[PDB]
Motif scaffolding. Structure first.
Motif, PDB file in Angstrom:
ATOM      1  N   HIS A   1      15.497  12.212 -14.962  1.00 46.93           N
ATOM      2  CA  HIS A   1      15.625  13.162 -16.057  1.00 46.93           C
ATOM      3  C   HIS A   1      14.264  13.769 -16.254  1.00 46.93           C
ATOM      4  CE1 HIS A   1      13.417   9.004 -17.434  1.00 46.93           C
ATOM      5  NE2 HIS A   1      12.307   9.511 -17.129  1.00 46.93           N
TER       6      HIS A   1
ATOM      7  N   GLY B   1       9.275  13.606 -25.132  1.00 47.99           N
ATOM      8  CA  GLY B   1       8.559  12.502 -25.564  1.00 47.99           C
ATOM      9  C   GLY B   1       8.993  11.840 -26.445  1.00 47.99           C
ATOM     10  N   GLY B   2      10.418  11.691 -26.608  1.00 50.54           N
ATOM     11  CA  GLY B   2      11.254  10.954 -28.130  1.00 50.54           C
ATOM     12  C   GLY B   2      10.400  10.872 -29.050  1.00 50.54           C
TER      13      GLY B   2
ATOM     14  N   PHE C   1      20.001   9.931 -20.040  1.00 52.16           N
ATOM     15  CA  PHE C   1      20.833  10.597 -21.395  1.00 52.16           C
ATOM     16  C   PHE C   1      21.697  11.123 -20.663  1.00 52.16           C
ATOM     17  CE2 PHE C   1      18.394   7.742 -24.436  1.00 52.16           C
ATOM     18  CZ  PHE C   1      16.333   7.776 -23.338  1.00 52.16           C
TER      19      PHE C   1
ATOM     20  N   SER D   1      14.932  17.169 -23.640  1.00 45.14           N
ATOM     21  CA  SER D   1      14.495  15.971 -24.358  1.00 45.14           C
ATOM     22  C   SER D   1      14.326  16.147 -25.906  1.00 45.14           C
ATOM     23  CB  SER D   1      14.541  15.252 -23.153  1.00 45.14           C
ATOM     24  OG  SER D   1      13.941  13.101 -23.237  1.00 45.14           O
ATOM     25  N   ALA D   2      13.680  15.085 -26.436  1.00 44.18           N
ATOM     26  CA  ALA D   2      13.476  15.639 -27.834  1.00 44.18           C
ATOM     27  C   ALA D   2      12.299  16.519 -28.217  1.00 44.18           C
ATOM     28  CB  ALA D   2      12.446  14.226 -27.896  1.00 44.18           C
TER      29      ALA D   2
HETATM   30  C1  LIG Z   1      15.112   3.804 -27.712  1.00 42.74           C
HETATM   31  C2  LIG Z   1      15.529   4.868 -28.145  1.00 42.74           C
HETATM   32  C3  LIG Z   1      15.351   5.684 -28.188  1.00 42.74           C
HETATM   33  C4  LIG Z   1      15.310   7.330 -27.902  1.00 42.74           C
HETATM   34  C5  LIG Z   1      14.263   8.131 -26.946  1.00 42.74           C
HETATM   35  C6  LIG Z   1      14.787   9.460 -26.571  1.00 42.74           C
HETATM   36  C7  LIG Z   1      13.807  10.099 -25.279  1.00 42.74           C
HETATM   37  C8  LIG Z   1      14.131  11.750 -25.369  1.00 42.74           C
HETATM   38  P1  LIG Z   1      12.760  12.646 -24.437  1.00 42.74           P
HETATM   39  O1  LIG Z   1      12.061  12.942 -25.127  1.00 42.74           O
HETATM   40  O2  LIG Z   1      12.208  11.399 -22.774  1.00 42.74           O
HETATM   41  C9  LIG Z   1      12.911  11.477 -21.904  1.00 42.74           C
HETATM   42  C10 LIG Z   1      12.863  10.253 -21.191  1.00 42.74           C
HETATM   43  C11 LIG Z   1      11.208  10.301 -20.759  1.00 42.74           C
HETATM   44  O3  LIG Z   1      10.792  11.102 -19.406  1.00 42.74           O
HETATM   45  C12 LIG Z   1       9.958  11.325 -19.431  1.00 42.74           C
HETATM   46  C13 LIG Z   1       8.672  11.827 -20.432  1.00 42.74           C
HETATM   47  C14 LIG Z   1       9.052  12.975 -21.121  1.00 42.74           C
HETATM   48  C15 LIG Z   1       7.842  13.314 -22.018  1.00 42.74           C
HETATM   49  O4  LIG Z   1      13.449   9.099 -22.163  1.00 42.74           O
HETATM   50  C16 LIG Z   1      12.206   7.743 -22.810  1.00 42.74           C
HETATM   51  C17 LIG Z   1      12.268   6.646 -22.169  1.00 42.74           C
HETATM   52  C18 LIG Z   1      11.187   6.051 -23.451  1.00 42.74           C
HETATM   53  C19 LIG Z   1      12.008   5.003 -23.742  1.00 42.74           C
END
Ligand SMILES: CCCCCCCC[P@@H](=O)OC[C@@H](COCCCC)OCCCC
Length: 311
Positions: A274, A71-72, A241, A142-143
């Motif tokens: 993703h 979730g970033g 990513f 992801s994060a």
């Molecule tokens: C501006 C740069 C921001 C970097 C965002 C890092 C997100 C990595 P991930 O946790 O989440 C993966 C994906 C979302 O995947 C679905 C939900 C995952 C919890 O990407 C988020 C896109 C929104 C910015």
């Protein structure tokens, strides 16, 4: 701040999709969960965890999976990955998934502290309720993959323990599996086109302006000189990513990290986006990916048992 408002509106969109998916999606069968345990003396609702188990246990303890959700760094809680945690549990594993406080209320150091508190809670109370902490799979998406990769290094390093203000826990990770990780966030503002300012904003919130966090925000900065467990890198060419996965393999090779991969090619289809194997546990490719991960974990756990004259 308009930038913060913009970040948050993108997560509220993600939250609506997550809510709709969950309403519809099939739920894995034959699992029990225990919810909403506080892992420290606090009333912050993010400082809580869920435990998941097969409804019928083959033994009194089961090999352990600990999940750090994605979730970033700005979004999610201990419930976001529940179907995924349930799936893994249904396969005969005891599973812990935690919340951690979100940016911008905290910075990276507070998120690492939360994760370590959940790990310490589990070293105290897990074994009595089914967790075999001799065989531990740490995973993050992801994060959450970022966070898992840092936790793995921090657990091995007295210096990083001191920097991040945590103590080591009394168990080791057998394997660390990263699912579409963003383990090198410093690289985000490069390309990212017209989103560089937003990406810089993420980085400032992660560091809280602390230069020590700036210098330790990437897996490449914390890996240096450590003897680490094996990693498994999971994702695919249709991850938004995917470049972060490419970058991490370069860091692995340069640091002699032991690793395996399960990377889906573009030819495997547009749906494999993703974190697909976390968000859609019931798809055949999610099943394949997740069982493969658990098999890799079992193979390492068996080798450890043989090495320790305990087969
Ligand atoms: C501006 C740069 C921001 C970097 C965002 C890092 C997100 C990595 P991930 O946790 O989440 C993966 C994906 C979302 O995947 C679905 C939900 C995952 C919890 O990407 C988020 C896109 C929104 C910015």
């Amino acid at each position: 701040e308009a930038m913060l408002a913009k970040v948050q509106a993108s997560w509220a969109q993600t939250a609506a999709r997550d809510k709709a998916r969950y309403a519809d999606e099939r739920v894995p069968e034959d699992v029990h969960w225990e919810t909403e345990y506080r892992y420290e003396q606090s009333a912050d609702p993010q400082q809580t965890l869920n435990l998941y188990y097969p409804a019928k246990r083959r033994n009194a303890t089961m090999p352990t999976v600990i999940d750090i959700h994605g979730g970033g760094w700005f979004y999610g809680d201990r419930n976001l990955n529940r179907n995924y945690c349930r799936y893994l549990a249904s396969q005969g594993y005891a599973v812990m998934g935690m919340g951690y406080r979100l940016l911008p209320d905290v910075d990276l150091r507070g998120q690492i502290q939360d994760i370590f508190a959940s790990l310490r809670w589990l070293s105290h109370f897990g074994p009595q309720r089914g967790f075999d902490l001799d065989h531990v799979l740490l995973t993050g998406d992801s994060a959450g993959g970022h966070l898992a990769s840092l936790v793995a290094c921090i657990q091995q390093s007295a210096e990083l323990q001191e920097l991040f203000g945590v103590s080591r826990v009394n168990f080791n990770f057998t394997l660390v599996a990263l699912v579409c990780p963003v383990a090198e966030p410093s690289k985000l503002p490069e390309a990212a086109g017209d989103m560089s300012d937003m990406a810089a904003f993420y980085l400032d919130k992660l560091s809280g302006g602390d230069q020590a966090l700036v210098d330790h925000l990437n897996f490449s900065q914390v890996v240096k000189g450590l003897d680490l467990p094996p990693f498994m890198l999971i994702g695919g060419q249709n991850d938004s990513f995917y470049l972060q996965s490419q970058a991490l393999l370069k860091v692995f090779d340069a640091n002699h990290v032991t690793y395996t991969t399960k990377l889906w090619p573009a030819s495997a289809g547009p749906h494999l986006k993703h974190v697909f194997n976390v968000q859609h546990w019931e798809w055949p490719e999610s099943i394949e990916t997740n069982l493969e991960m658990l098999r890799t974990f079992d193979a390492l756990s068996k080798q450890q048992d043989q090495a320790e004259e305990n087969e």
